[PDB]
Design a protein around this ligand. Structure first.
Ligand SMILES: O=c1ccn([C@@H]2O[C@H](CO)[C@@H](OP(=O)(O)O)[C@H]2O)c(=O)[nH]1
Ligand SMILES: O=c1ccn([C@@H]2O[C@H](CO)[C@@H](OP(=O)(O)O)[C@H]2O)c(=O)[nH]1
Ligand SMILES: O=c1ccn([C@@H]2O[C@H](CO)[C@@H](OP(=O)(O)O)[C@H]2O)c(=O)[nH]1
Ligand SMILES: O=c1ccn([C@@H]2O[C@H](CO)[C@@H](OP(=O)(O)O)[C@H]2O)c(=O)[nH]1
Ligand SMILES: O=c1ccn([C@@H]2O[C@H](CO)[C@@H](OP(=O)(O)O)[C@H]2O)c(=O)[nH]1
Ligand code: NA
Ligand code: NA
Lengths: 348, 348, 348, 347, 347
């Protein structure tokens, strides 16, 4: 069940825990696990978690190495724990969940998700593993992903992308789009209509629609005229205003990506975790414009246009609710004289 | 006055300390501050200072987030402490000064700079803050920056650039060029004529004059002929000599920047701090030429040309003094038969 | 013999230990050595070794700063210890050897390699240092490098590249190709014929033959036809197969380098050390193809072609032995119907 | 205004957390909490727990400073968590329980014991606190102590002693004997009839009956004759046999106390925690007799005599179950020819 | 040739820093200093301070090993720093002062006390060291101790006891009673008339007057009658009241010493530092009586009797100021009907 030296043997020989027999010599110093290779010590793992170093080492070695839902999705769906696996949170360099089921003797609260202690918890089930669909059917609270149809259950089509060893990708050699199912108190839920964030990053941003291609290629005024965006404050919200000491707008990742290719800037990720909305302390290196809390979301530009064009613009300020990544994201909408002033998501 | 959980609340909600009421749960493990977000721990701060972790966390959260003088300037002007702010040293990942005034109960030596304990110390005053010009007028020892004129005081025009959240920049949406004033023992000082370093970096180096543009674009022999630099050893001092085991010359940042675009090399910053002169252990990857102590300064090329063309070349070796960043920098000048052999700054 | 403050003085003033007299104030906190510079603490060294922080600091300061053999070569030749120097292992951020000879009072097992305790150990001798060739002649077990001929000893021509301050390079201003000699139990050995790995890296990979230039420039099918590689599974072994969930082949660095310029991927170096064969956990970001243990070797493409074209292809699977970096590397060769299926090195 | 600096203010000014307003400067280094007193740092708390230093500091400051059941009693009753207090485990220098209810934002799983997350946990309730008897009635799983009767509930009289700030004592100025009640799955459970251990220690051991006074003062042969203990191997079980390399017997604390006054020995407490039965690696300094696992229990000698005399001595070896401190303690009984060879508890 | 390895050489060979030449190999791990002795590591120093381990090691090695004033005296006199020595605080296992003068490159603010940076600090000067009386005369702020008269300066006779390597003692082979002098803002300051605490401890408490001998040997009623202490609540203040849940009185160390010989109790020193008044969280093991903040002072019983008998007993409650160890100690006096209820010092 447990053996630090056997975990290290699997890491050295298989790249992760693979259930192989064997042992290697291990040193633990502070928060770092070493193994002896021909007379000298080689670092295997640096603990960045709040768990004991040897426990975090084992959970990391036993991480799920298939494509799995991004942590923000599991969090938004209320997942508390995973059935017989570890979802490793690469944004936090730590397990996504505090406890485990049938993984590690120090963190297990149960060997199987059918045990009583798991009933009030929302357990994550993976239909790609034999028997887990049936475990979901019998579980009181849970979230299930599948690659195909489940008899008698209507699916919710999830995002196109998933996380594979910390790399978020849309799979071509592997399936990353899952069907989602959720049960609460033994009742199968109808998951709401939702947008999905695109989980792209600033430096290798790639467009996923013709509008996004046009946004990156065309000048600001050409793009706004082509897609008839006059009065929606896209100059402020998406392109960003760098003329004053406080940086204006800049709430869509594609706008940051366009600026970054032209002029670099600093993004301080002061709450480093996976979430649908991200807050950054941004400092523009060219102008000196800055903002302590700049909320950023990566929506497909077409989706963001649909959202802002579907709002009433008759009051000065109000909260707009948008279902994104299965959760209700609050946006602040500021208007003046029937046109938009700004529109930004809130991290909550 | 003091509350670790309130500091963390401000960091999470405002990106820095903003004087807001509230608390979040905090964990301190070794030298890392965490906060609990929906059942899991998220890292807020890793202490790299020699201060206690919770104290360094508070000083970092209370850092000045306006454009401020670079630490090398404050050090050269003899600044010991700041009035009611924290100058964060991003080169050292630590406070620029050991003690504080009216910032933190663990590090404060006073609540106000008018207290007796501050009289012998050179206190930094910021004229952009209400009342600090008057505090400078009454202070015994101090350095004051302003954006405009001060009645009855002659200013010293400082560098064009300043530091904003660790980004050194010439402000366009914000003012980064300050007037400087200094008092010693109650007497307003005449600050000397000085050159200023340009605070650029190796990889995104940008020219700031036509001579620098020509240096980057033209070949070595074309540039030297155009600006009539024969006999000043620019081939050695600025371009660098990579033909022997010991790397020759290479003491101006623009010369390193030109080499780096053509051929990468290793720069070991073995004294990592902000200073007018920097010493690097350099290893050229293409040739294997190396040098344990390679002194580098980032002067505007036009300024460096003026300096070296203003020296007497009649002795084999001597020390040349140049006022740079308000301090007296010693250069070694080596000559032979009336022409320069080398010319380099000394870190002292 | 020993002085922590004197080691730090040499680091600050000379960039490494240089035998100079002097002292600076030092702070040791956890695993970090600091020195006080004008009232504030500056980090000099962060200990990443399993040694005490002050001991590792001294060994790092006393590292060899000339071109030295890469650690993988010394390990393959059985080197246990170095004569009167420290070979710093930049892959491990630690000394390459556990003990020293005449370097450090905490780690020395002897002052001179002629002492009895060194006789059973394979001592590394550097012919560029006065007297070390003669010490090798009198030593029982040892490895010697020279830049030129040694009277009465036949040399083995080593690799073209060597390590200079952690930068692996083929020297142009300095000599990096050494003659190698080895003695075991007082008997000079005949070192075997061997290939050498090229020690290049993924991102600045440079071809070293016309075949490698053609591999990077031509399309897959053009290159295979030009060099008549039909039936040798180069599409699988070198170019890689990204069509299935398990990534196929990709065992030569030049193939990874070609893929990386076109499409980025993740390489997890889960045994971070210097070795002739490297194992990576690879995840392709474009396709999602991945493999937990992907063995990679950087052979000159011409050498790899010679190796695979010199094998018998008549059995389904067998182990092939290839002398590389002076050690016997085991390759697995898989064949079907007289053609290659795959061919990969094993890390052992 | 809950804060690290406010916790430290209460410790400095009140000796523990007392809900007072105020702050003092705090430094956290080396898993230790310091406060600044006239320019220099004074240590307030060294963390010996597996919790973060600032969290353990707060739980320690918020420890219950009234007499509370010993941790071994709470463990034997299956207590998982306490309602709105912290039971500090002075044998482990750590909280007795991992989580809290309405104590600390970092460790709370709930603010009140009525929340659903507490239902499957056995919550400790203190009838001396207003409202906690009613919370016990509504809790699905729990343990309740009171100083008096609770209408309708059948009580179990607990041990005479309790723990006050880490001092186990029989209260004279305070009450330390409580009624006990327990609920499992929403149903009140009958607590078993039980002996209680005496919770004494080697150095300041004091007899609590005439038989224990006789054992300490009389010689071995005289005591066994007076209390008619022939055939029960008291020479082995209680007095101990130091004649062989392996130390024989010595399973009652009073026997260790008698030996210790005569000749010192080493007791390695290799599982340092509060428990009804303790295991020690014992080395006798005079003879060199030793034993890696010597199980020791502190029963009133009268109780142990009552237990062993009630045994059937016709079997070579059998396991005997005795309820002690509300838990079932297994004893190994070795006999030969109708007399006892040895009789020892198991951990 | 000042160095970490040279400090360790002096510790190993001389027991402290003695200015000798030499070096030994040193390892620094776990906030601890080791040296290699015949192949294995031997611990020389465990850092308990908030300074870096190698810095604290040097300051400890350079500690003053002559009799020096107790830290509570230096604190009460406002001492900020010492001239060319280290006063080691054995109650905190740390330097008594943050910075140094001419001791250690990492902590020095100056090489000599005459430097301008020292002028606003109260520097401790030791007249037993050549030149330090003259440095006191030139210092703007300072405290001076001497073994004899200084011409022109009016002395204050200090306590009989001093601290030698952490042992507080009244010297017989060495002098421990010093003259004291103090300067503020360049002006010599008259030190007040003062009592001194006796600096005794619970275990090895020894009486130092016939009244203290009587207190330990006589019964409570007999002692109060002989010394005519009726109406002064000595039963409460000194002997302590253990009859209620809250422990009453017990504010003089001699009263704790008398109780401790009779029955043990726990004293939690939750602010562990040297101070004229100490606060303890006390738990009586026999009765269970306890008190979170019990202020205790070790005055000669004759001095305490002199203090309390000089009091006006006509007010329900008032604060009484008494100069002790050169500082103003506030006492709370509670009276009723012309007799004392309680009388305790405040920290
Ligand atoms: O009258 C107001 C007040 C605030 N804001 C907007 O509210 C946000 C927080 O102050 C800012 O939006 P931004 O971050 O996109 O620039 C600001 O412009 C308005 O638009 N109008
Ligand atoms: O006769 C001498 C001795 C030294 N140097 C120069 O002094 C510096 C330190 O040795 C080197 O300058 P560099 O770093 O720019 O190459 C060296 O060339 C001379 O020019 N001439
Ligand atoms: O019948 C078999 C079994 C295994 N392999 C090969 O053996 C290796 C480990 O399974 C893989 O080679 P690769 O890493 O280059 O893809 C696999 O294709 C074969 O070629 N044929
Ligand atoms: O046949 C047996 C086997 C074991 N034991 C007893 O079982 C215990 C563990 O081996 C020992 O009892 P002690 O610790 O009190 O000396 C041993 O004497 C017997 O008495 N008889
Ligand atoms: O009316 C009052 C209020 C307080 N106290 C006393 O003040 C102290 C703190 O409450 C206690 O004194 P003790 O610690 O010596 O017992 C208490 O009895 C009185 O005597 N009378
Ligand atoms: Na339970
Ligand atoms: Na003072």
């Amino acid at each position: 069940n447990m053996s630090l030296e056997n975990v290290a043997f699997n890491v050295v020989n298989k790249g992760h825990f693979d259930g192989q027999q064997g042992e290697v010599p291990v040193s633990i110093i502070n928060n770092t696990v070493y193994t002896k290779v021909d007379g000298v010590d080689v670092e295997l793992f640096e603990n960045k978690t709040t768990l004991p170093v040897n426990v975090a080492f084992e959970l990391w070695a036993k991480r799920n190495i298939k494509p799995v839902p991004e942590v923000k999705i599991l969090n938004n769906l209320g997942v508390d724990i995973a059935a017989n696996t570890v979802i490793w949170d690469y944004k936090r360099d730590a397990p996504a969940h505090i406890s485990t089921i049938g993984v590690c003797s120090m963190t297990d609260i149960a060997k199987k998700p059918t045990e009583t202690i798991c009933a009030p918890l929302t357990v994550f089930f993976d239909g790609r593993v034999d028997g887990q669909v049936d475990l979901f059917r019998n579980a009181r609270n849970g979230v299930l992903i599948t690659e195909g149809s489940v008899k008698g259950l209507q699916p919710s089509v999830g995002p196109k992308q998933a996380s594979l060893n910390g790399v978020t990708l849309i799979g071509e050699a592997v399936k990353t789009q899952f069907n989602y199912y959720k049960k609460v108190d033994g009742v199968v839920q109808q998951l709401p209509e939702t947008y999905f964030t695109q989980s792209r990053n600033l430096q290798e941003f790639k467009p996923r629609s013709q509008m996004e291609i046009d946004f990156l290629e065309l000048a600001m005024d050409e793009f706004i005229e082509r897609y008839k965006l006059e009065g929606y404050a896209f100059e402020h919200i998406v392109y960003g205003d760098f003329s004053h000491s406080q940086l204006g707008g800049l709430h869509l990742l594609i706008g940051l990506a366009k600026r970054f290719k032209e002029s670099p800037f600093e993004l301080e990720d002061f709450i480093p975790m996976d979430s649908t909305v991200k807050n950054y302390f941004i400092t523009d290196a060219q102008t000196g414009s800055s903002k302590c809390v700049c909320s950023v979301i990566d929506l497909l530009l077409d989706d963001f246009v649909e959202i802002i064009k579907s709002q009433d613009l008759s009051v000065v300020s109000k909260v707009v609710k948008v279902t994104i990544d299965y959760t209700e994201i609050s946006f602040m909408l500021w208007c003046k004289d029937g046109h938009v002033e700004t529109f930004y998501p809130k991290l909550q």
